[PDB]
């Protein structure tokens, strides 16, 4: 714990030191160097750290200066000073792996300037951090770094054995800049959620795959993604404010999600955002709820969905009298096995013979359900039966004939 | 105050009598090592085991999210009950860390909570988990039978089905539709008329273990997640097949959605 206690006190020092008005940044530079060295020594020899972070200034603001990412911010490859030990630099690269996973661009460069370690991984890292703006000529880069926006995003993109997420975000920014048409600085200032939402409104033909790729690239948070998706769906529906053709336009949006259940939750929540008189778009909106919840089968979710469907039928559709929209919804019931709320209504709504509409059974299930309804819901009117089991009719006629035959024999 | 003990017996007696009096988080976290300081073997009893019972239970409760830490002190010193409670809130993902911690921390931890007890816990959990429904508040017998009212006892519109399910009301005991009885407090509606909260005591513990019906109907996902935790893999698969066979016969019944079934 001597190394651990040393780290604790070392981190404690900056906690007060920051409170000072004029921070002797250079004086604490040795402190940060010592803190990192203590971390490395602990690794080599390999709540406390909780409180340490609780007062840690590893992310000290002015410590993360932009000039820490200057043109030669790292020592060159030939500037690989032989001050390291056998496994010290190895554990240093080990932690630096989490660092590149951590992604603190300024902090890593500050450590390197302090530690004077020539990880060529960091060399390409410093190459790319400013190559995001392409601020230096390609020939002007280092002898190992001197050797078409994506030319930089893929010249040695895979060469990053670790920290590939850096090049991933690099290409993400490259594509974003090429698309929107703004400089590196203007793009880099917009919020991640805002930029994603801006992508959401995009209706370019092939921008869907690139945008989804960039959404993977940002890697911010799933729930925000789901919120953005629900907002985009609502916006597209409001704009829209064949029937089998737009199903793909609908679904491919939900495809952007990671696991569809959270998207279903978000869509169900956004369904309450229906506008005043929003009926036609909201019909498809409600329709999407089943197409989402069914493929994963969250029974309670589907239960609330069925409640929502009955509510749409009664609160709105019953006053709306939209016969065609209701018919399409009933077709899209999915659990049309459980459509008792309008089952007798269709017959009462003069749909009984209208149930014989052609081209409405692409899979043939509508006519089968019509036969089921003729068997159960409305038995007796064989005319609608012919319009829509002939074995059931044969059995009934045979029973009537047998009854007539037995009446005489009685 | 500790050093000012009157007699040597008094120091040990106070140290022992203290812990059991509804301790506090830091209170335990200190008094434990405090009794450790100079007692060693002075009263082994079940005392050493009890000390261990938090000696790792702290680390157990010490793997969750910051906001999640708050309710973790509700039972942070009954580790056996703690794992089950962790299972209770449907909070699967949090379990995996606890399982790894227990396995890495079993290291001779003579605390009774041997991993076999853990396997029993998990098995019982899963059995409950994939389990498929297949003037005064009324009593259990006074609850209306599920097959008594084909339509809802209140809504009277949706028939009893796997998807079209219902619940038992808390006011008159009728089979009132949750849609018709969406409130929580003759046959009157709930409006007309929830994770585990564990404790040190076993009475309400039994009440909840007999009550905490995971309202989410039987969605294999939860079952697979829960099962993937214990170690009896072949036995796990046998349990899976057995539960499958248990499910099988229900199909011919007419109150289920056969397709999704």
PDB file of N, CA, C and O in Angstrom, chain A residues 159-220:
ATOM      1  N   UNK A 159      -3.570  -0.171 -38.943  1.00  0.00           N
ATOM      2  CA  UNK A 159      -2.278  -0.297 -38.291  1.00  0.00           C
ATOM      3  C   UNK A 159      -2.376  -0.060 -36.796  1.00  0.00           C
ATOM      4  O   UNK A 159      -1.501  -0.507 -36.049  1.00  0.00           O
ATOM      5  N   UNK A 160      -3.432   0.610 -36.338  1.00  0.00           N
ATOM      6  CA  UNK A 160      -3.625   0.832 -34.913  1.00  0.00           C
ATOM      7  C   UNK A 160      -4.004  -0.475 -34.233  1.00  0.00           C
ATOM      8  O   UNK A 160      -5.188  -0.817 -34.156  1.00  0.00           O
ATOM      9  N   UNK A 161      -3.004  -1.203 -33.734  1.00  0.00           N
ATOM     10  CA  UNK A 161      -3.275  -2.471 -33.067  1.00  0.00           C
ATOM     11  C   UNK A 161      -4.206  -2.268 -31.884  1.00  0.00           C
ATOM     12  O   UNK A 161      -5.118  -3.071 -31.653  1.00  0.00           O
ATOM     13  N   UNK A 162      -3.993  -1.206 -31.129  1.00  0.00           N
ATOM     14  CA  UNK A 162      -4.935  -0.743 -30.129  1.00  0.00           C
ATOM     15  C   UNK A 162      -5.501   0.598 -30.577  1.00  0.00           C
ATOM     16  O   UNK A 162      -5.100   1.159 -31.600  1.00  0.00           O
ATOM     17  N   UNK A 163      -6.461   1.100 -29.810  1.00  0.00           N
ATOM     18  CA  UNK A 163      -6.989   2.424 -30.061  1.00  0.00           C
ATOM     19  C   UNK A 163      -7.601   2.617 -31.425  1.00  0.00           C
ATOM     20  O   UNK A 163      -7.644   3.745 -31.921  1.00  0.00           O
ATOM     21  N   UNK A 164      -8.081   1.544 -32.052  1.00  0.00           N
ATOM     22  CA  UNK A 164      -8.720   1.684 -33.352  1.00  0.00           C
ATOM     23  C   UNK A 164      -9.949   2.582 -33.296  1.00  0.00           C
ATOM     24  O   UNK A 164     -10.307   3.185 -34.313  1.00  0.00           O
ATOM     25  N   UNK A 165     -10.595   2.691 -32.134  1.00  0.00           N
ATOM     26  CA  UNK A 165     -11.758   3.564 -32.021  1.00  0.00           C
ATOM     27  C   UNK A 165     -11.404   5.001 -32.356  1.00  0.00           C
ATOM     28  O   UNK A 165     -12.263   5.768 -32.804  1.00  0.00           O
ATOM     29  N   UNK A 166     -10.147   5.383 -32.146  1.00  0.00           N
ATOM     30  CA  UNK A 166      -9.716   6.713 -32.544  1.00  0.00           C
ATOM     31  C   UNK A 166      -9.858   6.895 -34.047  1.00  0.00           C
ATOM     32  O   UNK A 166     -10.470   7.859 -34.512  1.00  0.00           O
ATOM     33  N   UNK A 167      -9.308   5.964 -34.828  1.00  0.00           N
ATOM     34  CA  UNK A 167      -9.446   6.063 -36.274  1.00  0.00           C
ATOM     35  C   UNK A 167     -10.894   5.912 -36.694  1.00  0.00           C
ATOM     36  O   UNK A 167     -11.302   6.455 -37.724  1.00  0.00           O
ATOM     37  N   UNK A 168     -11.684   5.179 -35.910  1.00  0.00           N
ATOM     38  CA  UNK A 168     -13.102   5.038 -36.218  1.00  0.00           C
ATOM     39  C   UNK A 168     -13.816   6.378 -36.114  1.00  0.00           C
ATOM     40  O   UNK A 168     -14.512   6.800 -37.046  1.00  0.00           O
ATOM     41  N   UNK A 169     -13.642   7.071 -34.988  1.00  0.00           N
ATOM     42  CA  UNK A 169     -14.202   8.410 -34.865  1.00  0.00           C
ATOM     43  C   UNK A 169     -13.589   9.357 -35.888  1.00  0.00           C
ATOM     44  O   UNK A 169     -14.254  10.290 -36.347  1.00  0.00           O
ATOM     45  N   UNK A 170     -12.330   9.121 -36.266  1.00  0.00           N
ATOM     46  CA  UNK A 170     -11.676   9.958 -37.265  1.00  0.00           C
ATOM     47  C   UNK A 170     -12.400   9.853 -38.596  1.00  0.00           C
ATOM     48  O   UNK A 170     -12.758  10.860 -39.217  1.00  0.00           O
ATOM     49  N   UNK A 171     -12.637   8.625 -39.046  1.00  0.00           N
ATOM     50  CA  UNK A 171     -13.400   8.427 -40.269  1.00  0.00           C
ATOM     51  C   UNK A 171     -14.823   8.949 -40.125  1.00  0.00           C
ATOM     52  O   UNK A 171     -15.401   9.447 -41.098  1.00  0.00           O
ATOM     53  N   UNK A 172     -15.408   8.836 -38.931  1.00  0.00           N
ATOM     54  CA  UNK A 172     -16.756   9.352 -38.721  1.00  0.00           C
ATOM     55  C   UNK A 172     -16.799  10.851 -38.962  1.00  0.00           C
ATOM     56  O   UNK A 172     -17.680  11.361 -39.665  1.00  0.00           O
ATOM     57  N   UNK A 173     -15.838  11.569 -38.394  1.00  0.00           N
ATOM     58  CA  UNK A 173     -15.751  13.002 -38.627  1.00  0.00           C
ATOM     59  C   UNK A 173     -15.478  13.298 -40.094  1.00  0.00           C
ATOM     60  O   UNK A 173     -16.018  14.259 -40.649  1.00  0.00           O
ATOM     61  N   UNK A 174     -14.629  12.493 -40.734  1.00  0.00           N
ATOM     62  CA  UNK A 174     -14.321  12.724 -42.141  1.00  0.00           C
ATOM     63  C   UNK A 174     -15.581  12.644 -42.986  1.00  0.00           C
ATOM     64  O   UNK A 174     -15.861  13.533 -43.799  1.00  0.00           O
ATOM     65  N   UNK A 175     -16.363  11.584 -42.789  1.00  0.00           N
ATOM     66  CA  UNK A 175     -17.600  11.422 -43.541  1.00  0.00           C
ATOM     67  C   UNK A 175     -18.592  12.528 -43.210  1.00  0.00           C
ATOM     68  O   UNK A 175     -19.252  13.068 -44.106  1.00  0.00           O
ATOM     69  N   UNK A 176     -18.706  12.885 -41.929  1.00  0.00           N
ATOM     70  CA  UNK A 176     -19.633  13.942 -41.550  1.00  0.00           C
ATOM     71  C   UNK A 176     -19.264  15.257 -42.218  1.00  0.00           C
ATOM     72  O   UNK A 176     -20.131  15.962 -42.749  1.00  0.00           O
ATOM     73  N   UNK A 177     -17.977  15.600 -42.211  1.00  0.00           N
ATOM     74  CA  UNK A 177     -17.533  16.842 -42.824  1.00  0.00           C
ATOM     75  C   UNK A 177     -17.770  16.819 -44.323  1.00  0.00           C
ATOM     76  O   UNK A 177     -18.260  17.794 -44.903  1.00  0.00           O
ATOM     77  N   UNK A 178     -17.432  15.705 -44.971  1.00  0.00           N
ATOM     78  CA  UNK A 178     -17.650  15.616 -46.407  1.00  0.00           C
ATOM     79  C   UNK A 178     -19.125  15.747 -46.749  1.00  0.00           C
ATOM     80  O   UNK A 178     -19.473  16.311 -47.791  1.00  0.00           O
ATOM     81  N   UNK A 179     -20.006  15.253 -45.879  1.00  0.00           N
ATOM     82  CA  UNK A 179     -21.433  15.276 -46.178  1.00  0.00           C
ATOM     83  C   UNK A 179     -22.037  16.650 -45.917  1.00  0.00           C
ATOM     84  O   UNK A 179     -22.578  17.286 -46.828  1.00  0.00           O
ATOM     85  N   UNK A 180     -21.959  17.122 -44.672  1.00  0.00           N
ATOM     86  CA  UNK A 180     -22.608  18.379 -44.317  1.00  0.00           C
ATOM     87  C   UNK A 180     -21.992  19.561 -45.051  1.00  0.00           C
ATOM     88  O   UNK A 180     -22.708  20.495 -45.428  1.00  0.00           O
ATOM     89  N   UNK A 181     -20.680  19.541 -45.261  1.00  0.00           N
ATOM     90  CA  UNK A 181     -20.014  20.637 -45.933  1.00  0.00           C
ATOM     91  C   UNK A 181     -19.599  21.744 -44.986  1.00  0.00           C
ATOM     92  O   UNK A 181     -19.975  22.905 -45.171  1.00  0.00           O
ATOM     93  N   UNK A 182     -18.827  21.392 -43.961  1.00  0.00           N
ATOM     94  CA  UNK A 182     -18.319  22.359 -43.001  1.00  0.00           C
ATOM     95  C   UNK A 182     -16.896  21.978 -42.619  1.00  0.00           C
ATOM     96  O   UNK A 182     -16.479  20.827 -42.767  1.00  0.00           O
ATOM     97  N   UNK A 183     -16.152  22.964 -42.124  1.00  0.00           N
ATOM     98  CA  UNK A 183     -14.774  22.731 -41.725  1.00  0.00           C
ATOM     99  C   UNK A 183     -14.712  21.772 -40.542  1.00  0.00           C
ATOM    100  O   UNK A 183     -15.725  21.429 -39.927  1.00  0.00           O
ATOM    101  N   UNK A 184     -13.493  21.331 -40.230  1.00  0.00           N
ATOM    102  CA  UNK A 184     -13.307  20.428 -39.100  1.00  0.00           C
ATOM    103  C   UNK A 184     -13.712  21.093 -37.790  1.00  0.00           C
ATOM    104  O   UNK A 184     -14.342  20.462 -36.934  1.00  0.00           O
ATOM    105  N   UNK A 185     -13.366  22.369 -37.621  1.00  0.00           N
ATOM    106  CA  UNK A 185     -13.650  23.059 -36.367  1.00  0.00           C
ATOM    107  C   UNK A 185     -15.151  23.198 -36.130  1.00  0.00           C
ATOM    108  O   UNK A 185     -15.643  22.920 -35.031  1.00  0.00           O
ATOM    109  N   UNK A 186     -15.895  23.635 -37.149  1.00  0.00           N
ATOM    110  CA  UNK A 186     -17.333  23.822 -36.979  1.00  0.00           C
ATOM    111  C   UNK A 186     -18.018  22.504 -36.654  1.00  0.00           C
ATOM    112  O   UNK A 186     -18.897  22.447 -35.786  1.00  0.00           O
ATOM    113  N   UNK A 187     -17.629  21.433 -37.341  1.00  0.00           N
ATOM    114  CA  UNK A 187     -18.241  20.133 -37.096  1.00  0.00           C
ATOM    115  C   UNK A 187     -17.901  19.633 -35.698  1.00  0.00           C
ATOM    116  O   UNK A 187     -18.773  19.145 -34.972  1.00  0.00           O
ATOM    117  N   UNK A 188     -16.636  19.758 -35.293  1.00  0.00           N
ATOM    118  CA  UNK A 188     -16.188  19.190 -34.025  1.00  0.00           C
ATOM    119  C   UNK A 188     -16.833  19.847 -32.814  1.00  0.00           C
ATOM    120  O   UNK A 188     -16.728  19.301 -31.712  1.00  0.00           O
ATOM    121  N   UNK A 189     -17.484  20.996 -32.987  1.00  0.00           N
ATOM    122  CA  UNK A 189     -18.109  21.700 -31.877  1.00  0.00           C
ATOM    123  C   UNK A 189     -19.537  21.258 -31.605  1.00  0.00           C
ATOM    124  O   UNK A 189     -19.994  21.369 -30.463  1.00  0.00           O
ATOM    125  N   UNK A 190     -20.247  20.762 -32.613  1.00  0.00           N
ATOM    126  CA  UNK A 190     -21.630  20.353 -32.422  1.00  0.00           C
ATOM    127  C   UNK A 190     -21.712  19.145 -31.497  1.00  0.00           C
ATOM    128  O   UNK A 190     -20.814  18.301 -31.455  1.00  0.00           O
ATOM    129  N   UNK A 191     -22.804  19.073 -30.743  1.00  0.00           N
ATOM    130  CA  UNK A 191     -22.993  17.980 -29.805  1.00  0.00           C
ATOM    131  C   UNK A 191     -23.220  16.669 -30.545  1.00  0.00           C
ATOM    132  O   UNK A 191     -23.720  16.643 -31.672  1.00  0.00           O
ATOM    133  N   UNK A 192     -22.834  15.572 -29.894  1.00  0.00           N
ATOM    134  CA  UNK A 192     -23.015  14.268 -30.508  1.00  0.00           C
ATOM    135  C   UNK A 192     -24.474  13.943 -30.748  1.00  0.00           C
ATOM    136  O   UNK A 192     -24.854  13.493 -31.832  1.00  0.00           O
ATOM    137  N   UNK A 193     -25.315  14.178 -29.739  1.00  0.00           N
ATOM    138  CA  UNK A 193     -26.744  13.932 -29.898  1.00  0.00           C
ATOM    139  C   UNK A 193     -27.338  14.834 -30.971  1.00  0.00           C
ATOM    140  O   UNK A 193     -28.162  14.392 -31.780  1.00  0.00           O
ATOM    141  N   UNK A 194     -26.928  16.100 -30.995  1.00  0.00           N
ATOM    142  CA  UNK A 194     -27.432  17.020 -32.006  1.00  0.00           C
ATOM    143  C   UNK A 194     -27.009  16.586 -33.402  1.00  0.00           C
ATOM    144  O   UNK A 194     -27.813  16.597 -34.338  1.00  0.00           O
ATOM    145  N   UNK A 195     -25.742  16.205 -33.562  1.00  0.00           N
ATOM    146  CA  UNK A 195     -25.275  15.760 -34.869  1.00  0.00           C
ATOM    147  C   UNK A 195     -26.014  14.509 -35.308  1.00  0.00           C
ATOM    148  O   UNK A 195     -26.397  14.378 -36.477  1.00  0.00           O
ATOM    149  N   UNK A 196     -26.229  13.580 -34.381  1.00  0.00           N
ATOM    150  CA  UNK A 196     -26.981  12.381 -34.711  1.00  0.00           C
ATOM    151  C   UNK A 196     -28.395  12.730 -35.151  1.00  0.00           C
ATOM    152  O   UNK A 196     -28.894  12.191 -36.143  1.00  0.00           O
ATOM    153  N   UNK A 197     -29.054  13.639 -34.431  1.00  0.00           N
ATOM    154  CA  UNK A 197     -30.402  14.034 -34.817  1.00  0.00           C
ATOM    155  C   UNK A 197     -30.402  14.685 -36.189  1.00  0.00           C
ATOM    156  O   UNK A 197     -31.320  14.471 -36.989  1.00  0.00           O
ATOM    157  N   UNK A 198     -29.378  15.487 -36.476  1.00  0.00           N
ATOM    158  CA  UNK A 198     -29.243  16.073 -37.802  1.00  0.00           C
ATOM    159  C   UNK A 198     -29.144  14.988 -38.858  1.00  0.00           C
ATOM    160  O   UNK A 198     -29.746  15.092 -39.932  1.00  0.00           O
ATOM    161  N   UNK A 199     -28.389  13.935 -38.565  1.00  0.00           N
ATOM    162  CA  UNK A 199     -28.335  12.797 -39.474  1.00  0.00           C
ATOM    163  C   UNK A 199     -29.713  12.167 -39.608  1.00  0.00           C
ATOM    164  O   UNK A 199     -30.088  11.673 -40.677  1.00  0.00           O
ATOM    165  N   UNK A 200     -30.491  12.180 -38.525  1.00  0.00           N
ATOM    166  CA  UNK A 200     -31.789  11.514 -38.540  1.00  0.00           C
ATOM    167  C   UNK A 200     -32.716  12.128 -39.579  1.00  0.00           C
ATOM    168  O   UNK A 200     -33.407  11.409 -40.308  1.00  0.00           O
ATOM    169  N   UNK A 201     -32.739  13.457 -39.670  1.00  0.00           N
ATOM    170  CA  UNK A 201     -33.586  14.110 -40.655  1.00  0.00           C
ATOM    171  C   UNK A 201     -33.102  13.896 -42.079  1.00  0.00           C
ATOM    172  O   UNK A 201     -33.837  14.225 -43.016  1.00  0.00           O
ATOM    173  N   UNK A 202     -31.895  13.368 -42.265  1.00  0.00           N
ATOM    174  CA  UNK A 202     -31.344  13.209 -43.604  1.00  0.00           C
ATOM    175  C   UNK A 202     -32.142  12.177 -44.390  1.00  0.00           C
ATOM    176  O   UNK A 202     -32.469  11.103 -43.875  1.00  0.00           O
ATOM    177  N   UNK A 203     -32.449  12.506 -45.645  1.00  0.00           N
ATOM    178  CA  UNK A 203     -33.234  11.647 -46.521  1.00  0.00           C
ATOM    179  C   UNK A 203     -32.464  11.287 -47.786  1.00  0.00           C
ATOM    180  O   UNK A 203     -33.063  10.976 -48.815  1.00  0.00           O
ATOM    181  N   UNK A 204     -31.134  11.328 -47.722  1.00  0.00           N
ATOM    182  CA  UNK A 204     -30.322  10.973 -48.871  1.00  0.00           C
ATOM    183  C   UNK A 204     -30.465   9.484 -49.171  1.00  0.00           C
ATOM    184  O   UNK A 204     -30.710   8.677 -48.271  1.00  0.00           O
ATOM    185  N   UNK A 205     -30.313   9.098 -50.438  1.00  0.00           N
ATOM    186  CA  UNK A 205     -30.620   7.706 -50.807  1.00  0.00           C
ATOM    187  C   UNK A 205     -29.747   6.679 -50.108  1.00  0.00           C
ATOM    188  O   UNK A 205     -30.257   5.650 -49.648  1.00  0.00           O
ATOM    189  N   UNK A 206     -28.442   6.927 -50.013  1.00  0.00           N
ATOM    190  CA  UNK A 206     -27.502   5.952 -49.473  1.00  0.00           C
ATOM    191  C   UNK A 206     -26.928   6.374 -48.127  1.00  0.00           C
ATOM    192  O   UNK A 206     -26.082   5.670 -47.568  1.00  0.00           O
ATOM    193  N   UNK A 207     -27.378   7.505 -47.587  1.00  0.00           N
ATOM    194  CA  UNK A 207     -26.833   7.983 -46.326  1.00  0.00           C
ATOM    195  C   UNK A 207     -27.266   7.139 -45.138  1.00  0.00           C
ATOM    196  O   UNK A 207     -26.756   7.355 -44.039  1.00  0.00           O
ATOM    197  N   UNK A 208     -28.195   6.202 -45.322  1.00  0.00           N
ATOM    198  CA  UNK A 208     -28.668   5.402 -44.197  1.00  0.00           C
ATOM    199  C   UNK A 208     -27.558   4.529 -43.628  1.00  0.00           C
ATOM    200  O   UNK A 208     -27.321   4.520 -42.416  1.00  0.00           O
ATOM    201  N   UNK A 209     -26.870   3.779 -44.490  1.00  0.00           N
ATOM    202  CA  UNK A 209     -25.812   2.895 -44.016  1.00  0.00           C
ATOM    203  C   UNK A 209     -24.661   3.690 -43.422  1.00  0.00           C
ATOM    204  O   UNK A 209     -24.142   3.349 -42.354  1.00  0.00           O
ATOM    205  N   UNK A 210     -24.248   4.756 -44.104  1.00  0.00           N
ATOM    206  CA  UNK A 210     -23.171   5.586 -43.585  1.00  0.00           C
ATOM    207  C   UNK A 210     -23.554   6.192 -42.247  1.00  0.00           C
ATOM    208  O   UNK A 210     -22.737   6.250 -41.322  1.00  0.00           O
ATOM    209  N   UNK A 211     -24.797   6.647 -42.127  1.00  0.00           N
ATOM    210  CA  UNK A 211     -25.252   7.255 -40.886  1.00  0.00           C
ATOM    211  C   UNK A 211     -25.285   6.236 -39.761  1.00  0.00           C
ATOM    212  O   UNK A 211     -24.866   6.527 -38.639  1.00  0.00           O
ATOM    213  N   UNK A 212     -25.791   5.038 -40.037  1.00  0.00           N
ATOM    214  CA  UNK A 212     -25.784   3.999 -39.019  1.00  0.00           C
ATOM    215  C   UNK A 212     -24.361   3.669 -38.608  1.00  0.00           C
ATOM    216  O   UNK A 212     -24.077   3.445 -37.424  1.00  0.00           O
ATOM    217  N   UNK A 213     -23.449   3.638 -39.577  1.00  0.00           N
ATOM    218  CA  UNK A 213     -22.047   3.421 -39.265  1.00  0.00           C
ATOM    219  C   UNK A 213     -21.538   4.502 -38.329  1.00  0.00           C
ATOM    220  O   UNK A 213     -20.875   4.215 -37.330  1.00  0.00           O
ATOM    221  N   UNK A 214     -21.860   5.756 -38.629  1.00  0.00           N
ATOM    222  CA  UNK A 214     -21.425   6.845 -37.768  1.00  0.00           C
ATOM    223  C   UNK A 214     -22.064   6.749 -36.395  1.00  0.00           C
ATOM    224  O   UNK A 214     -21.468   7.175 -35.402  1.00  0.00           O
ATOM    225  N   UNK A 215     -23.281   6.216 -36.326  1.00  0.00           N
ATOM    226  CA  UNK A 215     -23.958   6.049 -35.045  1.00  0.00           C
ATOM    227  C   UNK A 215     -23.238   5.009 -34.212  1.00  0.00           C
ATOM    228  O   UNK A 215     -23.082   5.158 -32.995  1.00  0.00           O
ATOM    229  N   UNK A 216     -22.799   3.933 -34.855  1.00  0.00           N
ATOM    230  CA  UNK A 216     -21.907   3.000 -34.186  1.00  0.00           C
ATOM    231  C   UNK A 216     -20.621   3.698 -33.775  1.00  0.00           C
ATOM    232  O   UNK A 216     -20.083   3.446 -32.692  1.00  0.00           O
ATOM    233  N   UNK A 217     -20.124   4.589 -34.628  1.00  0.00           N
ATOM    234  CA  UNK A 217     -18.851   5.248 -34.367  1.00  0.00           C
ATOM    235  C   UNK A 217     -18.928   6.122 -33.124  1.00  0.00           C
ATOM    236  O   UNK A 217     -18.004   6.139 -32.303  1.00  0.00           O
ATOM    237  N   UNK A 218     -20.022   6.865 -32.972  1.00  0.00           N
ATOM    238  CA  UNK A 218     -20.159   7.741 -31.818  1.00  0.00           C
ATOM    239  C   UNK A 218     -20.176   6.937 -30.525  1.00  0.00           C
ATOM    240  O   UNK A 218     -19.502   7.288 -29.552  1.00  0.00           O
ATOM    241  N   UNK A 219     -20.940   5.846 -30.503  1.00  0.00           N
ATOM    242  CA  UNK A 219     -20.972   4.963 -29.348  1.00  0.00           C
ATOM    243  C   UNK A 219     -21.372   5.635 -28.054  1.00  0.00           C
ATOM    244  O   UNK A 219     -20.975   5.176 -26.979  1.00  0.00           O
ATOM    245  N   UNK A 220     -22.139   6.720 -28.126  1.00  0.00           N
ATOM    246  CA  UNK A 220     -22.477   7.484 -26.934  1.00  0.00           C
ATOM    247  C   UNK A 220     -23.319   6.683 -25.947  1.00  0.00           C
ATOM    248  O   UNK A 220     -22.852   6.353 -24.854  1.00  0.00           O
TER     249      UNK A 220
END
